[PDB]
Design an enzyme around this catalytic site. Sequence first.
Site, short mmCIF file in Angstrom:
data_model
loop_
_atom_site.label_atom_id
_atom_site.label_comp_id
_atom_site.label_asym_id
_atom_site.label_seq_id
_atom_site.Cartn_x
_atom_site.Cartn_y
_atom_site.Cartn_z
N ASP B 337 2.04 -13.05 16.02
CA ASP B 337 1.48 -13.51 14.75
C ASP B 337 0.65 -12.50 13.94
O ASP B 337 0.61 -12.59 12.71
CB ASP B 337 0.60 -14.76 14.95
CG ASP B 337 1.41 -16.04 15.19
OD1 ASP B 337 2.64 -16.08 14.93
OD2 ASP B 337 0.80 -17.03 15.65
N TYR B 425 4.78 -23.16 12.27
CA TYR B 425 3.73 -23.69 13.13
C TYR B 425 2.38 -23.65 12.42
O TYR B 425 2.10 -22.73 11.65
CB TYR B 425 3.55 -22.87 14.42
N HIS B 476 3.84 -20.09 24.66
CA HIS B 476 2.77 -19.67 23.80
C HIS B 476 1.76 -18.89 24.61
O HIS B 476 1.33 -19.36 25.66
CB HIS B 476 2.04 -20.86 23.20
CG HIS B 476 2.85 -21.64 22.22
ND1 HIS B 476 2.81 -21.41 20.86
CD2 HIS B 476 3.69 -22.68 22.40
CE1 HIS B 476 3.61 -22.27 20.25
NE2 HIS B 476 4.15 -23.06 21.16
N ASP B 485 -22.58 -10.02 25.95
CA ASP B 485 -23.73 -9.16 26.12
C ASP B 485 -24.81 -10.09 26.65
O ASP B 485 -25.70 -10.51 25.91
CB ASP B 485 -24.19 -8.55 24.79
CG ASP B 485 -23.38 -7.35 24.34
OD1 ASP B 485 -22.37 -6.95 24.97
OD2 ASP B 485 -23.78 -6.78 23.31
N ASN B 620 -8.01 4.17 33.50
CA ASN B 620 -9.09 4.99 34.00
C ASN B 620 -10.04 4.30 34.98
O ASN B 620 -10.97 4.93 35.48
CB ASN B 620 -9.87 5.70 32.89
CG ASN B 620 -10.49 4.76 31.87
OD1 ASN B 620 -10.47 3.54 32.03
ND2 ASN B 620 -11.03 5.34 30.79
N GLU B 622 -12.67 2.32 35.29
CA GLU B 622 -14.04 2.72 35.12
C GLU B 622 -15.03 1.89 35.91
O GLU B 622 -14.79 0.71 36.22
CB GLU B 622 -14.40 2.74 33.63
CG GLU B 622 -13.69 3.85 32.89
CD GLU B 622 -13.92 3.76 31.41
OE1 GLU B 622 -13.28 2.90 30.77
OE2 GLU B 622 -14.73 4.57 30.90
N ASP B 628 -21.82 -1.99 29.45
CA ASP B 628 -21.41 -2.87 28.39
C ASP B 628 -19.97 -3.32 28.70
O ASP B 628 -19.02 -2.54 28.60
CB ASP B 628 -21.52 -2.16 27.04
CG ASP B 628 -21.23 -3.07 25.88
OD1 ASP B 628 -20.79 -4.23 26.12
OD2 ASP B 628 -21.41 -2.63 24.73
N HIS B 639 6.27 -24.29 26.59
CA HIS B 639 6.65 -25.40 25.72
C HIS B 639 8.19 -25.55 25.79
O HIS B 639 8.95 -24.76 25.22
CB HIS B 639 6.20 -25.14 24.28
CG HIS B 639 6.50 -26.26 23.32
ND1 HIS B 639 6.25 -26.14 21.96
CD2 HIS B 639 7.03 -27.50 23.50
CE1 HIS B 639 6.59 -27.27 21.36
NE2 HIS B 639 7.08 -28.11 22.26
CA CA Z 1 -20.57 -6.53 26.35
CA CA Z 2 -11.31 1.57 30.88
CU CU Z 3 5.71 -24.43 21.02
#
Ligand code: CA
Ligand code: CA
Ligand code: CU
EC number: 1.4.3.22
Lengths: 710, 715
Positions: B337, B425, B476, B485, B620, B622, B628, B639
């Site tokens: 989409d 849809y 779907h 955070d 990678n 990490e 963060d 469906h």
């Molecule tokens: Ca975060």
């Molecule tokens: Ca990464």
């Molecule tokens: Cu559907």
Amino acid sequence: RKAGVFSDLSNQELKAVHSFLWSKKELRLQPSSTTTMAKNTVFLIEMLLPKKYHVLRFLDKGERHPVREARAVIFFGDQEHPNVTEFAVGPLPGPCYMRALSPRPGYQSSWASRPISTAEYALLYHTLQEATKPLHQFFLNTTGFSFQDCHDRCLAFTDVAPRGVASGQRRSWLIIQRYVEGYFLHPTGLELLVDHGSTDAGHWAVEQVWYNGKFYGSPEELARKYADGEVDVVVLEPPLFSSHKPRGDFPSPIHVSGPRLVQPHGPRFRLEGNAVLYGGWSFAFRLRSSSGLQVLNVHFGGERIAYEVSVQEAVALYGGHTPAGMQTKYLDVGWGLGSVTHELAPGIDCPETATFLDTFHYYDADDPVHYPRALCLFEMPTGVPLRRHFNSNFKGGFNFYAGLKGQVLVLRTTSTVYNYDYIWDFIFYPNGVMEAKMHATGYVHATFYTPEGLRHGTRLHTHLIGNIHTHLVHYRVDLDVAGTKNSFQTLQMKLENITNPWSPRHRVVQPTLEQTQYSWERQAAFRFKRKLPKYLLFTSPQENPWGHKRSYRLQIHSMADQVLPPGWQEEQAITWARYPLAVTKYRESELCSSSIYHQNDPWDPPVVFEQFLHNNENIENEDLVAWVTVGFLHIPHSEDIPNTATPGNSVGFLLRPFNFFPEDPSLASRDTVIVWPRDNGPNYVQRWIPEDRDCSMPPPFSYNGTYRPV
Amino acid sequence: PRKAGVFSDLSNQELKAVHSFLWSKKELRLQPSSTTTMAKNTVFLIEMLLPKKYHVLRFLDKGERHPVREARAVIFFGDQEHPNVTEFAVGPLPGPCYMRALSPRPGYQSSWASRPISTAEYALLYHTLQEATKPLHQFFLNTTGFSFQDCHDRCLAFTDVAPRGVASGQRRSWLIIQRYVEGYFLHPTGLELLVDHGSTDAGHWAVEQVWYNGKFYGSPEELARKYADGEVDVVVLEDPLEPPLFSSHKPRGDFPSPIHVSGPRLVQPHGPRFRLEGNAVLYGGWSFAFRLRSSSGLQVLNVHFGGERIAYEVSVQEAVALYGGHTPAGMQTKYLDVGWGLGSVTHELAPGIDCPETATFLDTFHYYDADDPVHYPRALCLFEMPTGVPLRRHFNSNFKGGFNFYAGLKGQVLVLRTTSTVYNYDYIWDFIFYPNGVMEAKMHATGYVHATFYTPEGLRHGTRLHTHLIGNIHTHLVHYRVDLDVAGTKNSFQTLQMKLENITNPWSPRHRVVQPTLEQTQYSWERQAAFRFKRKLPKYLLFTSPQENPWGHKRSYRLQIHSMADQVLPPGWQEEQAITWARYPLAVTKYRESELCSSSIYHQNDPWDPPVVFEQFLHNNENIENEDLVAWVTVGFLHIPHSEDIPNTATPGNSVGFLLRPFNFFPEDPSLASRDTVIVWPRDNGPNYVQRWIPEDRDCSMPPPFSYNGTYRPV
Ligand SMILES: [Ca+2]
Ligand SMILES: [Ca+2]
Ligand SMILES: [Cu+2]
Ligand SMILES: *[C@@H]1O[C@H](CO)[C@@H](O[C@@H]2O[C@H](CO)[C@@H](O[C@@H]3O[C@H](CO)[C@@H](O)[C@H](O)[C@@H]3O)[C@H](O)[C@H]2NC(C)=O)[C@H](O)[C@H]1NC(C)=O
Ligand SMILES: *[C@@H]1O[C@H](CO)[C@@H](O[C@@H]2O[C@H](CO)[C@@H](O)[C@H](O)[C@H]2NC(C)=O)[C@H](O)[C@H]1NC(C)=O
Ligand SMILES: *[C@@H]1O[C@H](CO)[C@@H](O[C@@H]2O[C@H](CO)[C@@H](O)[C@H](O)[C@H]2NC(C)=O)[C@H](O)[C@H]1NC(C)=O
Ligand SMILES: *[C@@H]1O[C@H](CO)[C@@H](O[C@@H]2O[C@H](CO)[C@@H](O)[C@H](O)[C@H]2NC(C)=O)[C@H](O)[C@H]1NC(C)=O
Ligand SMILES: *[C@@H]1O[C@H](CO)[C@@H](O[C@@H]2O[C@H](CO)[C@@H](O)[C@H](O)[C@H]2NC(C)=O)[C@H](O)[C@H]1NC(C)=O
Ligand SMILES: *[C@@H]1O[C@H](CO)[C@@H](O[C@@H]2O[C@H](CO)[C@@H](O)[C@H](O)[C@H]2NC(C)=O)[C@H](O)[C@H]1NC(C)=O
Ligand SMILES: [Ca+2]
Ligand SMILES: [Ca+2]
Ligand SMILES: [Cu+2]
């Protein structure tokens, strides 16, 4: 109403059964309230459903109303060898007979298996008051509360179950608490084991004492060690933390009431007795005092979908550091799951616009007891359209907008056995989807904090551990899809890898539709280890106009898993919890997956669900029953104080039509709105019912809080 | 509320300012979107380009200056020897001076083929079909009663599928031919056409293959000849133009229990209890900002509860429908989409239907395949609605015929809602906020299914829904970015499980206790926290702060996923490269400015070699201890269509999403600050005392009369 065949007993009927039994002098009946265990008493009376064979001949083939009967459970304590025996009492009206039910040759633990009663608790409290006299000073010094001359500073207890280590024992661990607002959350650190098996409460004894991480043998020994300085003691206006009273401040405080539902034009469902009509739907309901809410003879568009959808059992299985904690496997049907349907608060528990319904229960009572607003029935906007479409012209306009406002009908009750409040819903959408839901709220089961507790729960306050546990709920789902004889099938997506038909040097790797048929019960008994197919279908041989078998789909909403090891000890009581879904051939001997006896004899209970599968019967074109386990692991957290809350804490399942109706069955709804463009004028808003903006007031709030005979 | 402006979408004025700045650069040779040639330079999309998180947080949290405000501008350079798509960042706003390179992809050679389809392109495709199918004109009249040439009310139409070819750089679309009637999506004729529209000269475009009713024919002329020669098994369709058409929403049938009145409705006599100002919302404990990104959809940003941050961003990233089929168009269809302007098809919400009559309805502007910024009325709504179930309640029985108290708090939730209707849809996108610090993301699906012409062979890939109609099987899948955070930027990820122990019964040593214990698992590296569908997903998924609550437990938020998704395509196979995020119900990455999105507008039309491959963010592996973190969530459902899906799929049971719940974050239930709580207390020999902190409401109000516009135009 034909639905009356499914109805619970009236006050009058309960009185008639009670009067009939009390007319039999040889039973030596005494009231539930009498404070001895050495008495014969009628513990429970409820309607006993007729055989499905007879019910369907009455509903579908114009034959006579089946005989109406009561189940009466009698505690025979006033004899040399006490037992519990059950009887069918009938007919109603005008009872004549009393027929004994469900014998268990060779089973010797009937008496020990029976539920606890108010009278038994009264005797336990007396036992505790006396047995703990040596600890009176210890209580005052450590808690400021006691059992003696205590008034507004009294200790209380919470019993756990099951009650021992083997069938026939009645030895209960008791968690001592300060009796304050929300007392469930005030453990003192003392736990006591009481043997209360004898019918002579003078024989009952405290056999073991646990205090703050150590066993002490007797109250006298703990008292002596305390006096000698040999006990590691824990010495225990804003609201109490265990209170619901507001405290704290939001950064953006709210000082006004929120939006509310108005129903100026009255209910759009019809309620007559226990019969409900709503749009395409027709059903009956009952509140079985032992096991809870049921919907029966459920039809949509005049065709049967389900003969019975019912609550069967609800369990909470704990671990803990304390003996009471590690003992706790609570099974609610052992406590009258359907009889603790306490008063629904208008505007809070159900909308202010809801229809509130009273009921009567006879469960551990001297007379039938009136429960005000035990159930409610209401239509509610869901806040999301049942369907909508914006048909754009992709050139800055539209061909039409079509939409149908979302509404659902909710039938609701609750169960509050003690600390927890469960909210039980059966929900009906205008397009033939129905949903079962259970939401958990109220207070958690909690024990005294010590560091060792952190291996079995979470510290929630200074002296409080919220014990880890799993909630498991079982439902019986007797689908009769367009009638009694059905089959069961599942659908999966499976990829194929083919030559691309328009570019043969390339491949198409794509979905295909795979159908699996099931012939024998064992094939349809899905364990938690097994991959649950995404489409679980109960089918009629009847086809829709497009050549597809008419079906209803079961969709489960659950976080449950296998909790106890299959085959180990108390697991025998909850073998149904091995299967998120199992399918059985209908049998009158298999109407229930649990019983009021399972709680106190989980080792050798009268119903073992696994046994329903032993004969591994053919399930092709038979009367099938689906059984559904839903649940969740609950590791408590500080936000559970004072109460667990409902957001995210619900489980259940959906039943959705699947090639059952030739097109969307909500198309009969006259609430649909279509907006059409017009050349050079305003749009045409096409409606089949006028726009309404009326407002009205509901009744002023009231709440009674008592439940008494009438 | 002014600070939420950093997250705000562009205004009409800002969009105009960006467009004007670009049009002032005569070297760009810009023409309008509506010009019917592909060989042109045009600005395809303009939307706000979010500043770097580092700078936003210094603004929000440390009193530093507002970051520079910029727009993303996507330019289609079709008027040159080697056409391409190039993006720029235009700023500052206000007063645009520069256009700097944005998301450059040097060495990639298929950007032109990867670009989204436009209205101009569809017009040229229609012209191509009108010419190419001339040999079939009589075939069309005889079999359908409709035509491409000389039509007025009996016009054929087409639905294009994507992706468009078999390799990167191709633009060859399969087109499903349909009759243009009410709910035309459900009226396939049995013809499908493959068109190569890669050239910027539409005169070179050709129908390269033809499928009709189970057979391939090579060209329109060959099918016309075989038809004329009586060698085609044709299906003659009935006339579709008193009862409603099956594809219409008009009522038909009658319920056995008549409903002649409106159902219950919400009233809000006291007005909103939330504070909405610009794109800033306050609601009890909650504070958040929101935006509707034209390319990718709804987002909530800088989400706080009780004055502490919970999430920097929760956003829609992609929405996919992956099909099988017996027909070439069906077996081709993998719709993404975002390739169609998922966030730009936010069409008008109907009051009382799409949102309650009491909702606050908000307009927006989009610039996506347009000549000027376009006004979208009631594109979003924000409303409080009773959930019908109490947030908490307890009956404190005395077990002797009465009670000690009843306490309860009426259930309410705040809903921020938009929609996406690309074509057939209609998805409904909710972010929901409960008064106890729980938030929920939800997508509901409704509108018309993607469908193809019925033949028997179709039943291996779908369900017969009408005489000539197959609803194709599909899955779907929706991707969300969940930049939690928790109490701040630095978090860890952990899971909890129940594990049994088997110990000596401490009070009865001849016996055993087999019981639950609480097991904690820590995760140190990204790969460890990338959960595949085959992997057992723990029941407790926790994002933790090092800060402890007063009881010694780490302050956390829990992610709880509501989905029936599973692995659909084989990992590593061809077009699966476009949706590698769909391998993972949950994956956790280290935050990076170069990994803000899991998809793009380009993925749909080059799924083989797309500009973002989610799997690459995990390469990678990490460290994710005290970093963060970004959680990424796949939700969805298989469906298999069924006859109840006619005319439209319905919302009951057809939603998926997730919840974020506080877990030892607050000292006790954070809804305790709500003054809506009621406690009823017994009194000896008297009526009960009903204790309240807000007076009882029974006031009345009325909403405005319903209106609906249906147009979306420049202002
Ligand atoms: Ca975060
Ligand atoms: Ca990464
Ligand atoms: Cu559907
Ligand atoms: C995608 O298309 C754009 C637009 O055509 C390309 O950017 C343009 O690149 C050309 C170089 O081919 C720049 O043209 C001019 O070249 C003369 C040298 O004869 C130089 O002296 C001028 O200063 C100027 O650079 C043109 O400025 C530049 N246009 C823009 C708007 O950036 C782009 O290179 C193409 N991308 C790829 C990857 O091929
Ligand atoms: C449980 O106790 C009941 C009641 O005392 C016993 O039922 C009686 O059984 C005797 C002997 O068969 C009959 O003469 C009486 O008519 C019964 N009384 C009633 C009220 O039914 C019963 O035997 C005991 N059950 C078991 C399994 O031992
Ligand atoms: C689908 O099937 C094709 C054909 O069997 C597989 O393609 C073959 O892959 C092998 C190993 O990579 C190659 O050596 C052959 O040359 C391929 N043959 C053809 C005809 O292309 C393909 O890998 C399969 N894909 C999946 C996802 O199963
Ligand atoms: C709860 O309900 C009962 C029954 O309606 C109330 O008892 C009635 O009180 C009314 C009003 O004074 C008296 O006229 C009747 O004598 C009582 N009827 C019965 C059957 O007892 C009771 O007062 C209510 N309690 C509360 C706290 O509201
Ligand atoms: C829990 O552990 C106990 C002790 O190891 C197991 O009990 C033993 O089981 C075997 C049979 O497999 C017997 O031969 C032993 O006599 C048992 N020992 C004791 C001390 O009881 C028990 O099976 C375990 N249960 C589970 C569910 O793991
Ligand atoms: C859709 O909204 C537009 C903008 O409000 C309407 O256009 C206005 O129509 C009124 C007539 O009621 C005129 O007075 C204005 O001149 C029009 N304004 C503009 C900017 O065109 C339009 O009529 C609405 N369309 C529908 C079908 O309701
Ligand atoms: Ca069987
Ligand atoms: Ca059945
Ligand atoms: Cu719980």
